Amino acid sequence: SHMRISSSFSFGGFTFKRTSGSSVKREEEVLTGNLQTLKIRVHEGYEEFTMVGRRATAILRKATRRLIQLIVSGRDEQSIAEAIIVAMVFSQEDCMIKAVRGDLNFVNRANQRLNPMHQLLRHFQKDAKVLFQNWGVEHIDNVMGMIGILPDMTPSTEMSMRGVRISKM
């Protein structure tokens, strides 16, 4: 049932669909720098998702708590950043957890406490500076139709945030 439920869903304003590979679920306690414990539902294994939003789309390959490749197209800098934020949170990477600042106590529109993955999502939806700063950058190859993006959102032909590429298409 875990495979079935995680095959198609909405997260962070994006429709996710699994296109390849599998995972198993498990509950994993993590600790933010503010020493807050979050019990997250972790996907264990290699999978590939497509993400479709209002103003951006992405393709994501990930493994257990590790983003492998992310390609995003968007209408503008804002919508592209938004897609990158959701992918980074969804990746469940340690460096994303470690980018949290302060305590998370987000509530939905009925004033009920949001689940841990949504605590993370809400947090970084407000400001992704620490997230992008701590994610990491790498050298990239020059591939036609693709360009890198730095943590300050400036495009670069030489470097990019780790695993992240922006499609000109």
DSSP 8-state symbol, 113: B
State how beta strands 137-139 and 159-161 pair: antiparallel
Chain position carrying tokens 């980074």: 88
DSSP 8-state symbol, 78: H
Look at the alpha carbons of 41, 56, 140, 152 in this order and tell me if their dihedral is positive or negative.
negative
- Give burial (CB, 10 Å; 0-12/13-18/19+) of 49: buried
CA distance 106 to 112: 8
Q: Distance between the two ends of the chain, CA-based, in angstroms?
A: 36
The approach used to solve this structure was X-ray
CA distance 165 to 142: 11
Instruction: Of 68, 113, 116, 102, give the one whose Cα is nearest residue 88.
Output: 68
CA distance 34 to 91: 21
Q: Are 67 and 86 in contact (CB under 8 A)?
A: no
**Rg, Å, the chain Cα set:** 16
Å resolution of this model? 2.0
